[PDB]
Each structure stands twice: as structure tokens, then as C-alpha cells.
Design an enzyme around this catalytic site. Structure first.
Site, PDB file in Angstrom:
ATOM      1  CE  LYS A   1      58.423  41.155  29.415  1.00 27.44           C
ATOM      2  NZ  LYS A   1      59.323  40.531  29.340  1.00 27.44           N
TER       3      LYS A   1
ATOM      4  CE  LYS B   1      56.651  37.614  30.926  1.00 32.64           C
ATOM      5  NZ  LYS B   1      58.125  38.174  31.287  1.00 32.64           N
TER       6      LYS B   1
END
Ligand SMILES: *[C@@H](CCC(=O)O)[C@@H](C)NC(C)=O
Ligand SMILES: *[C@@H](CCC(=O)O)[C@@H](C)NC(C)=O
Ligand SMILES: *[C@@H](CCC(=O)O)[C@@H](C)NC(C)=O
Ligand SMILES: *[C@@H](CCC(=O)O)[C@@H](C)NC(C)=O
Ligand SMILES: *[C@@H](CCC(=O)O)[C@@H](C)NC(C)=O
Ligand SMILES: [Mg+2]
Ligand SMILES: [Mg+2]
Ligand SMILES: [Mg+2]
Ligand SMILES: [Mg+2]
Ligand SMILES: [Mg+2]
Ligand SMILES: [Mg+2]
Ligand SMILES: [Mg+2]
Ligand SMILES: [Mg+2]
Ligand SMILES: [Mg+2]
Ligand SMILES: [Mg+2]
Ligand SMILES: [Mg+2]
Ligand SMILES: [Mg+2]
Ligand SMILES: [Mg+2]
Ligand SMILES: [Mg+2]
Ligand SMILES: [Mg+2]
Ligand SMILES: [Mg+2]
Ligand SMILES: [Mg+2]
Ligand SMILES: [Mg+2]
Ligand SMILES: [Mg+2]
Ligand SMILES: [Mg+2]
Lengths: 328, 328, 328, 328, 328
Positions: free
Chosen positions: B200, B255
Site C-alpha cells: 500500500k 493499493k
């Protein structure tokens, strides 16, 4: 990645349908299906094949009628297999390139009636020789390589002239893909695809195809063994595929199917090219026999086809294409 | 494989729809879609999010009603994101593990009403802290790693108690997956999946999520940069994923999404594990803005999602899940 | 290596039997064969299995008699499958570890009579539960992982006590190999091999085994799907095998067989460990049905087994072991 | 795969013969054996070779008689080595292509008498030159590459005309495989295999072959070193093999054998092509000497041959072929 | 890299000595040589070994005298093999750890006299058991794994106490390297190297070692086969080496040598760790026999040793070490 029980429990993703769906690696769709069809001469003819329960040989009029349902189901292509009349067979396999042969007539009819349907013609001499072997024989009964290629090239050209989008050379002659490609390019058939039967084995699983078409009754023995591959060999299939891609094939195929899933996997991994697999007549028959006997649930049909996808196949030639297209 | 023009013409397979379908490498299906949803407290509440055109924040009653259509479309799971009331925020993020918090209440309601629907809860402290940062802060405003993990563990346990099949730890604390796994195993929640947000990034693409939830207004800068990944780094993502798999994650996630497709590819290739990707709020908003303006055709929605599949994603968290599930 | 027609003609090596033999990549021998056998209680009992033509369930006296011919043929091992009397079934699967159970009695008898014959016992609860599922069920009908392992461990110990050289845990519980290994090591059964069923799929090909043994009538559906592998998944099999090797397995197995040859190939290539494959009841039945109908030549038996060798299998569990051992 | 003692004990599979057989990675069979034979001119001649105990040089009549036993044992091929009379030697090596030379006469006789027996002729000039070097010499005693190829090509053609199924060019001239292939293809000998001696080293292990045939008495020194490979080089063998495959070889060979097993392994792994290895005269003699002295058990014969199989050889040229074919 | 004749002629680099030297891939030096020596009890004793022409068993005084020449030649280490008096043999192999055993006495003497000379002691029970097997036997004549390790550990400690820089465990017991390492570390012998015999095969090539030492007369058969490796197996050697490195080995060894060069190559490539190889007694004897008979030139000695270097060996245990050190 040092995954260890109980931190890693591979059953967690299996717990619920939703998580199985989320992690599922492969999905089978109607886009993966090619239906082989046996085509008779004449009109208003339908014949059941005893060793392929549920499969019928169809005259061209009947084929045109049945094809409407296959198109409706979304099956992308048919692979045509003519059932040559005995009187049309010869030592020089001349019927293979007859502009009015069953395959050529059926192609013209289907291309006109269903312009979006893929027609994959069979480039092969076994349905046209008196002896049913996969090429022209010399004095000793040996299938001559380069002489057979001359006939295959004419046949492929006649299929292109009839409108076939794909020609599929299925007799294991060396160098045939390059010869057929050169001829198509020289004649201006720039977009006719070649689906090479690249790693085609000397198999006993073709048994029921003899009953369907009336070609060679000998399968997987000494004659076939001089051109079809030895079932024991895996590395050799990579050399077969490499040659066919260099020679211009648009797609490459492994045959038979389920008994050769490791070959499908190695071919897809090694070349990353469009890879096809044939679930042959004997694979169809053994599944159908067990289903009819109540020995296996009908669900083995989708499991068998899912296996080809998982192994790396882009498309599957399968007599189950219609039944599968419904269950999907 | 020495493929050369004109023997090889890559346009032949592209000539017709049927051959494109036969060689197509990837297919997107509803099985690949996870719908993130913003959940309000109270009853009979629906609120439009200006920076996410078409997306609404819903109270639990409204969520239950809308979920019936999502289940009908075959969407396998929802990812819940509570919109915490300001009065419930604190320095210790205690609301994260409140058995009567929005996330816990919504999970219990959905598990009862739709037993087959996957519920993926968000294990994170940013919606619960007064400051909106992704953990507990020390005196210097630094997000403390191990102290934050203690709260995340309680939160994950409370989600398991509420019936969540999947907990998704989305704050980049080191070692949190192992800590959460140990706690779930010790408490007997043997089958609760952990969907780790493994790689992420410290991204500006989370912009609209602030408007949706009311978490940190600072994105992709100095504070976030001490735990979220530097956008420049690719190799580092492999080390993140390796640690999360060793610690017990059932699924791993990259992400944001489209700006990180190369990461999805490397992660899938390197670990061959269930790999997920989040098409974040900013990716949704920029697509929607261009569509609404008539600058891009609505077809970019399926193209964007097909890209995640091609890159190697097994599943996709996407605000387009409902629209996609219709177009498929 | 830039091999090109006509300098390279892959038919040259195929021209003659002697050159085919020289280049043949794999050879099948009796050393590759393991015969599964169904064992009845009582004395002087032989029962035909309608869905497995030619296969008989045998009482222990009959098994001892038949085994002399199998030993003479050079078959290295048997895999025993007891046909538990309905009155011996229970919710706690206690008969699994009965020192006087069929499997234990049969093992003791065979170890004494034929000391060199390999005995591979089945570590599984499905033949012993009233419901026929592969473990102990909770209130919701879910197969409990760790509770089932406790019973499997006792069962494995009882097999080691009876003299089994190999125990083969065939129920897909997570972490069972490590638990069974720890118990065998702690009890001093230092040389008892564990043949893990590592990548065992939720398959419909197990159909005839129900008729043979009287276990679960549900196959490849929702219950089995919470522990057996999804047929669509290939990468997941590598994670299954890696865990079983880390946990102490001496051999690892893929099941079913032919529909999973790509898995055999990936497992052998990835781990280079002793790899086994099960040609299951449904594979046997579909081949036998086609042979009996005259649809396939009997030569498909050796072709099917050669495929497992080519794919990378070291050994093959096959109901064709006796017929194969003669044809070789 | 994190395998650790005592969970992993590699002795368990070794405990019993049955489990050793189940996990055995390679098996040697008579299909792997090629017998080299020394052929004399005249009739009713048999001569013992002092440095190769048990090996005899045979006139063609005697060869025909002995061959019946070799065929009966199932040895797939012979490699013929003529013992040229001194009066037939010349500077231009003309006897190499004499249609009535020993090799040509022996080939014709064997092809007629045993049509299924593989005949591998030796394409080499050393038995035909007055000086015994492996080609035609220039004024400085250097073996001329392209001039030697002209003679080798005629020799190979004469072997094809005599009926040889395989020609084996054993003198290390660059580009000879392509030249021989072009000539065979142009003359219509489409199926004559070429077994290239691809990585043939400048070795002292050929010592006893001088006594057998009467070729060069210098071995592994300055003259041989200008065409045979330096024993120190491994990577160079890959370049040798790559060139021979590109030039059309059907099989590739490493020579000598046991002292070059790492080369066999690298060649098989790198090219996945039919790979052969020669257990040369000196390897035979040193084994035989030790056996006769009672220093080594006769079992070293099968161990030596098993090593070639394990290293990746498809076939083995070995003077032990008859003894091995009995012990197997 | 598309290298093709005549642009590429691999003979050019072979043309002259200078270019052969420039491209030579490997060089053998005295740094690669370890001399095994057979050590007698008593004083003023030298005994010829009939099956190892030129090799003598030496009492410690004689060993000290001969060692001065070996040190002068630059041989880096000796591998000591005591010839245990029959009266010192026992069922518990107690002489293995006698502080006044031949190996311990010889080590102390050599460490004092030549401080820079490497002493590699043999950690093995076969020279100390009455039966000559490689460990302690149970009631059935089976070599007990963990009981044998207890004795090996004491033996290794006694060698470290005597000053050995390297202990070389040569009996194939599972887990022995870790046990010996733990004991050395716990006793403060932090720098004693362990040279593991990792992939040691059940070979017939150890024949003459029986005559030298008086250990087991059975070689490569059923007893040895329960711990030494099956000659057919290659992949298994990688698992053996991986375990020994994880357990703390400083160096790993393949044995025998020349018949296992493919194993040396795979081990070096797979682990990139210090890799050793033993040119065993039978390899020495067969070379010596052929040299003495005039069947092979003495140059085969350096060729045999160059092969080990080319295959990837860092060092070579060889009875030819003195002769080689002169010829280099
Ligand atoms: C392959 C056989 C297909 C089948 O058995 O179903 C085709 C192309 N023809 C032959 C003769 O092998
Ligand atoms: C990720 C952002 C999702 C989005 O932008 O759509 C979530 C888990 N929360 C934060 C604060 O990053
Ligand atoms: C596997 C099935 C074997 C077969 O179908 O032949 C065994 C171990 N049992 C079950 C219940 O799957
Ligand atoms: C190789 C030598 C075979 C042997 O030594 O047994 C042959 C082809 N000839 C020469 C001269 O090297
Ligand atoms: C190995 C044998 C060495 C040789 O044969 O030269 C040693 C360590 N001992 C035994 C008994 O194998
Ligand atoms: Mg054909
Ligand atoms: Mg081909
Ligand atoms: Mg695919
Ligand atoms: Mg497809
Ligand atoms: Mg956060
Ligand atoms: Mg992390
Ligand atoms: Mg994917
Ligand atoms: Mg998916
Ligand atoms: Mg079971
Ligand atoms: Mg498992
Ligand atoms: Mg194998
Ligand atoms: Mg085997
Ligand atoms: Mg020569
Ligand atoms: Mg060359
Ligand atoms: Mg091989
Ligand atoms: Mg072979
Ligand atoms: Mg020993
Ligand atoms: Mg070991
Ligand atoms: Mg080196
Ligand atoms: Mg060195």
C-alpha cells in the site's frame, strides 16, 4: 514464502463459496469451445455413430440447420471433418483439393449463412486415400513427407478459396506449416490462419474417429509411429511447436488432450503463444460411456474442460461443446 | 521462436471476432469484483459524495436494502468502510473495537440477512482517531507501530466476533498480520481470512476517500511516508508481500491499482498466491469525471478492470462493481 | 537452437523402431505401480463392484491368496482400503484406530506373509463416520480441521503399530502431515513413511469409489469443496505440496490423475521430490467401459500409465496395476 | 521446501527395497545400449585386442553370426568401426568412400540380414589416412577443416547408399554436420539420421582404440588439441551442441563418457534434445582390468551405465552392451 | 547468440597453444588437492595395499616423515583413515572416541609438527565396529540412526580435542551434521569445520578401501542401501545437501567422484557453497591398473582431476594428490 500451519490454513479460502470464487485461478467460458462436426455427402442425412453416443454425422443441409443453435449458444468455431464416400478415395488423395468436395462445399455454405462463425478446415489426406493413411505411400507403405506436403498445400489453398478463416494441418508431416504458409501468402490469402496440430501423438484414443470418418483402422502402432509422436516423449513436443511457430502457425495444438495435459502446460509456458488442445473421440466416448452407465456424474464434463483451461489451453476442440455451452 | 513477417502476421488472429475470442488471454467476470461501501450510523440516511459521483454513504438499513441487488448481480463480497461520527473519535481509537460500532453492527446484520455474501471488514485506526492518522501517535506525532497493532488486534477480534469472514488490515504497521493471525488462532477463529493490504503506497489517489469517510486530510506526504510505501519502489513490495504470507495472510493486496499494475504483475509472478488490487476513490473519480464530461466513453470502465485481470489480479476492490456486473 | 526444416526433420528419429527406442524419453516399469485393494471383513468373501468391472472386494484370507500373484508380478506395494461394516461406523470415527479393524488386521497379516511387500495404509475418516464425510462434523455439518487431525493421528499410530511401512493421509485437513509426523517420531516409528495426498481435488472422478467402499455419496460439491481443492486451481497445489514437505512427508501425491497431469508436472519440477499420482476409480471405470464396448483398444491402459511417467510421476496408484504388470 | 530433521529423514525411503524402487529416479534398459564393433577385412577372422580384454575384431561373416545374439538380447544398434588394412590407407583418405570398403560392405550385409537392427556408421578419416590423423593434412601437418569436410561428405553419402540408418561424424571439423546434411538432403536420403559427436574432447581415454583400429597413436596432445575440445572447458560444449542442432543433427553426443558426466547433464538440460554418450575404450579397459584383478566387483558395470542415464543420456555407446543386456 | 559456421569456427581458438590458454575455462592447482592416508598403529610399519598399487598404510612415525614431502609440495590437507586393530573393535564402536585412538594420536602429532597443514578426520563408525557396518546395529542388523549419531558426536568432539581443524562425517546418518555442530558449538569448538559427506552413494567403487582399512566387505547392496544413496537418484542429492548446509556444514561433498560428476555440477550450481568430491579407492585402482598395463597414458591422472574442477569442485580428495602435485 515460509508459509506454515497454523498461521497458514489453506482451508480458509475454501470455507465459503464467495472466497472460492474470489481465489479461483481459471474460468471456462463458451469462448474456449470449438465443436468438431462430421459431414456427409448428399442431402437429408443424419447418422448415429455407435462408439460416440449422441454424436451424429450430418449432410450439409442438416449441418446448416444445427449450426444455428451452435451460433445461438455462442460457440465461436466449428472444426469440419468430411466423411468421404469410398468411391472418391484414391492413391493420390485428389479429393482433398476438389473444389466440390464435402469440406469445400460445407465451408462455402457456412461462410455465407453465418459470416461470424469460425470455420476450421482439416488439412489432412487420411479421409481421401484408399488406404486411409495420413499421406501418400511409397512402394514399402511408408508415408512420403514432401510428396504429401504437395497435396496438403493444394488442399489448404482450396479451403482458403472456399472461404475458410482457419486451415488446420493435422497430418504430422515435417515442414508442412511453412510450405502451406508460403503458398497462402503467395496466393494473397494473407489472413487465413493456420492452426497447427504441432504435438500430435501416436495414440489409441483416436479409436472412435475411425467409426465416425472411415479413415485408418490402425492407430498408435508402427505406421503411425513414423510421423505421430511417441507418447513417452515430452521435450520433443517443444521442438515440434518451435518449428511450427517459426514456420508461421497462428495457433498451435496438442492432441490428444487429457492424457497430454502436462504437454499443454509445457507448450504454453515455453512459447506463450495461442495454445489449443483436442479432447479426442476416445476421451468423449469413455466419458459418455461412464455417464450413461451411471458410473460418473455428468459434472465430469465441465471438470474435464476446466482441466484444459487450468493446464494453459486457450481453446479446446471438444465433442462436448454444445453440452458444455449450456452448463456454463 | 524465430517468428518473422510475413510468415507470422499477428493481425490474422485479430481479423475476426471468433478468433479474437479464441486467443483472448484473460476474461473478467463478476467473480472478480468486490464492492467497497461507506456506512453511516443512524437510520434512513443516504448521502451523496461530491468527489465520487454516483457513490452514496448509506445507513445500515439502506445498506441491507441495496445489498439485495448486489447479491442478485452475483457480486461475491463487500468491503465495509464505516463513517465514524466525530463524537466517537478518540486518541486511543477505542471505537475500532466497540462491539456496537458501525462496522460490527453492519457485519452482524449482513451475515444474518445474506449468509453467502462475503463481508470484508477494514482493520484500521484512521476512521477512529481524533487526528485521522493510521495509528496511535506518540508525543512527536509519529504513528507507533506495536502500540497500534494492539488496537488493530482487538478490532480484528471484534470483527470476527460479529461474524466477518474476512478481516482486511489496511494500515501499514509492520508485523500486524502475524499478530492478528496469532490472536484469531488463539481465540478459535480458525477460518477468518486475512486479506492483507501488503503493498500500500503513499499515494495522492486516495483524495476522495477523505470526503467519503472523514479520515486524514494529508495524503502521500511526510507522515504517511513513514509507513505507506514510496511510489518509486518496486522490489520493496516483494519484501512486504513475503512477510505477510509468512505471517499467515490468506490473500495479499496492492493499493492503489492502475498506477501500480506492474506491482500486481510482480507480486502474482513472485508468489503465486491469491492477489487482490484496489481501484481506489481517485481512480474512480477521474474515470467518472471524464465519462460525465463526454471526454471518455463508458467502455473505459471494463477496460480498466480487464487491465487488473491481465496484470494478474484474482479480485478487484472497485466502486464500479455494480456497473461492471451489469456490463458483463 | 535455430532448428529448421529440412535440415531438421523430426520424423527421422521416428523412422525405425530402433531409433524410437534410442530417443524414447520415459519408460514405464512394474517398479512404478501401486495396486489399491478393497478389503472386506469376515472370511471367504469376494464381491464384484458393478461400477469397476473386474475389481473385487476381498476378505483378508482372499487378499493373502491374491497377493502372492501380485508379489510374483513384482508390484512393489499395495494401498489398502477397508470396506467398513455399517455397524462399526460412528460420529467419532473410533473404528479408524481399532487395533482389530480391517486395515490393521490386513496389515499385520500381509507384513508377516510377504515381508518385502509395501503396505500403504489409508489415513482417513470417511470409511468410519456414520455420515461418510472426511472428518468429524460440527453442529453445522462442517468438517472440523484440528479435531479430525486428533483422530487421524491415532489412526496413523495404529497403522504403524500393525507394521505398515507407509501411512497415506488422504483427507485434506490442514497441518495433518506435521501432526502425524510428530506423533510417529515421538512414539519411535522413525522409519514409517508418510505418503501425503497433497493436491487432492474436489472431483467427480471418485464416483465408483463410493460403490466400492460405502463412504460419502456426495462428490465434488459444497461440503467436499471446503477441504478438497478447486479443479480450477494450479498455483495453489504448489502451496499444498510445499507445506507437506516442510511438515515431513516422504512422498507427495496428486489426485485424481489424468485430469491433473499438468499438476503432476508442476509439482515434480517445483520440488524435485518423490511424486505420486492416483489414477482413480472413475478413470479406471471410463477406460474399462470403453474397452469392454470395443470403443478403445486395450493399449490405452499402457498409454494412460506412460502419461503419468512422462508428466513426472515416480509411482502410480492404479487399479490396472496387475494388467499393466503383465503387458510390461 | 524447509525440510528439516527429524520431520524429514531421507533414510525412510531407503529403508526397504519396495520404497527404493518407488522413488528411484532413473532406470537403465537394453533400449539405452549401442554396441561398438571392430570390423576386419577378409573371412573367418577373429582377433583379441590385448588392451580391451574380452573384445574381438571380427570379419564380416563373424560379425553377422555374433549380431544374431545381440539382436536376440534386444540391443537396438551397432556402431561400426572398420580396421582398415595398411595397404588401403592414403593421403587423400579415399578408402573412406569406397563403395567396397569394410564399413560399406558390413552395412549392406547387416541391413539385409537384420532389417530392424540400427547401423551407425563412423564418418571419420583417421582409419583411412596414412598418418592416422582425423583429416587431410596441409604442408605443416595441420588438419584442414573444409578440405576434410569434402571427404567426410562423400563418405557419409556412401554410407547412406549402403543402407546405413545413421551416420555418426566423429572428427571434430567445424560445420561438418551442415555440409553432410545438405548433401544427404540434396541426394534424397531424407531419413538418414546424423548422430553428431558434438562435444568430443582431446582425451587420453581413447588409448586402447589405437590398438583396436590402428589410427593415430598420439592422443590428447598438440595436434588433436587443434580440433578436439580442451578437457577444461564446459561452456564451450554448449556452443558446439547448439551449432550441430542448427546444422541438422538428429542426435548429439558427448565423448568420452564418465569423465564428462557434467557435460552430459548441461547438454541435456540446455537443449532438451536426444543426447548420447560414449563410454570409450579406456573406460572399458580400466573397468575390465580392475574386475579381472578382483579389485572391483562386476556390479560397477551397471553402476557406470546407470550414471550415464542419471546424467541425462538417452543412449550409451558401450563395449559392455552385451554384458549389460544380460544383467538387466 | 545465432553463431553460425563459417562466421563462427570453434577451431580458431583451438589453433594455437596461446589461444587455448587464453580461453581455458578451468585450471587445476595444488590448492585443489587433499591426500587421504591410511594410518597404522605401532611404530616403524609400512604396508603395501595390493588393490591400490603404490599406496601404503603407515604408522604415525612414518606418516610424520612422509608428510614433510606433502607439505613441501604444497598439498593443503590430509584426510586421515585409521586402520583399527581387530582387538579394538566392538559392538558399541567405543574406539571411535578413544583419546588414544590412532586418529586422535595421529592428529595431535601432525598438528604439533606441521601447524599449517589441514587435518581432516573421519567421523565414522565402520572402522570401529566388529561387524564393519557404518553404525550401531539393532537386533535385525539395521543401522540405528540416532543411536549412531550419539557415538559420532563423541568421536567428533574427541577429534576437536586432538586439534583437528576439520571433522568429516562420512556415515550417512540423517541429521548428524546438526547434532555434531550443536555439540562442537556447546563445547566451544567454534572454528572446527564440518566437511559433510552429503551425497554419498551405495557404490561398488569403494572395493579397494576394504583391503586398505578392514571395514565392511559388503558394498553397494541391501544394508548399505538403507543409508547410502541409490546411484540412480540425482534430485535426492540436492535434498541431502540442503539439509547439511542448514545444519551447519562448512563444506559439502559428493562421493564417489568421476561416476557422479553430474551430481558435483548440480550441487555447485544449486547451492554455490564450498563443494568437494572424493576420487575413491576404486577410481584410483582402475586408473593405476590401466597405467601399469600400458593401456592408458599417465596423462589420464591430470585429465581425471581436471574433470572434477570443470564439474564445479573446489577441492578433491584423491590418492593421486602427490603425483598430481608434481605434474602441476
Ligand atoms: C484427429 C482425431 C480426432 C479424434 O479422434 O476425435 C484427426 C484430425 N484425424 C486423425 C485421423 O487423427
Ligand atoms: C484505502 C483508501 C481506499 C480509497 O481511496 O478508495 C483505505 C483502506 N483507507 C485509507 C485511509 O487509506
Ligand atoms: C481417494 C479416492 C480413490 C478412488 O476414487 O479410486 C480415496 C483416498 N478416498 C476418497 C474418499 O476420496
Ligand atoms: C572415438 C574413440 C572411441 C573409443 O576410444 O572407444 C572414435 C570415433 N575414434 C577416434 C579416433 O577418436
Ligand atoms: C569412503 C570410501 C573412500 C574410498 O573408497 O576411497 C570412506 C569414508 N569409508 C567408507 C567405509 O565408505
Ligand atoms: Mg491425418
Ligand atoms: Mg512438425
Ligand atoms: Mg489461459
Ligand atoms: Mg480461451
Ligand atoms: Mg488507514
Ligand atoms: Mg508490511
Ligand atoms: Mg489470473
Ligand atoms: Mg478472480
Ligand atoms: Mg477421505
Ligand atoms: Mg494440505
Ligand atoms: Mg521420472
Ligand atoms: Mg518409478
Ligand atoms: Mg577421428
Ligand atoms: Mg563442432
Ligand atoms: Mg533420460
Ligand atoms: Mg534411452
Ligand atoms: Mg562409513
Ligand atoms: Mg544426510
Ligand atoms: Mg570452481
Ligand atoms: Mg580449489
Amino acid at each position: 514464502a515460509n508459509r506454515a500451519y497454523p498461521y497458514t490454513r489453506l482451508r480458509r479460502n475454501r470455507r465459503d463459496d464467495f472466497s472460492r470464487r474470489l481465489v479461483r485461478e481459471n474460468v471456462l467460458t463458451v469462448d474456449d469451445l470449438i465443436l468438431p462436426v462430421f459431414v456427409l455427402d448428399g442431402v437429408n442425412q443424419r447418422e448415429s455413430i455407435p462408439s460416440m453416443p449422441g454424436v451424429e454425422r450430418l449432410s450439409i443441409d442438416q449441418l446448416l440447420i444445427e449450426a444455428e443453435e451452435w451460433v445461438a449458444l455462442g460457440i465461436p468455431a466449428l472444426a469440419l471433418f468430411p466423411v468421404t464416400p469410398v468411391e472418391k478415395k484414391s492413391l493420390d488423395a485428389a479429393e482433398a483439393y476438389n473444389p466440390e468436395g464435402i469440406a469445400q462445399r460445407a465451408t462455402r455454405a457456412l461462410r455465407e449463412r453465418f459470416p461470424e462463425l469460425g470455420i476450421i478446415t482439416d488439412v489432412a489426406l487420411d479421409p481421401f486415400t484408399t488406404h486411409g493413411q495420413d499421406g501418400i505411400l511409397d512402394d514399402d507403405g511408408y508415408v512420403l513427407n514432401d510428396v504429401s506436403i504437395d497435396v496438403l498445400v493444394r488442399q489448404a489453398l482450396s479451403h482458403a478459396e472456399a472461404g475458410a478463416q482457419v486451415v488446420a494441418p493435422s497430418d504430422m508431416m515435417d515442414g508442412r506449416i511453412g510450405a502451406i504458409r508460403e503458398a497462402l501468402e503467395s496466393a494473397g490469402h494473407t489472413n487465413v490462419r493456420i492452426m497447427a496440430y504441432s504435438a500430435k501423438y501416436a495414440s489409441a484414443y483416436y479409436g472412435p474417429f475411425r467409426d465416425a470418418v472411415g479413415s485408418a483402422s490402425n492407430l498408435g502402432k508402427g505406421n503411425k509411429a513414423t510421423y505421430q509422436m511417441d507418447p513417452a516423449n515430452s521435450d520433443e513436443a517443444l521442438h515440434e511447436v518451435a518449428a511450427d511457430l517459426a514456420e508461421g502457425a497462428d495457433m498451435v495444438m496438442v492432441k490428444p488432450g487429457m492424457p497430454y495435459l502436462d504437454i499443454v502446460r509445457r507448450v504454453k509456458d515455453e512459447f506463450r503463444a495461442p495454445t489449443f488442445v483436442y479432447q479426442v473421440s476416445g476421451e468423449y466416448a469413455m466419458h459418455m460411456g461412464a455417464i450413461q452407465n451411471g458410473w460418473l456424474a455428468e459434472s465430469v464434463i465441465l471438470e474435464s474442460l476446466t482441466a484444459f483451461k487450468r493446464a494453459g489451453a486457450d481453446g479446446i476442440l471438444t465433442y462436448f461443446a454444445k453440452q458444455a455451452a449450456e452448463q456454463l
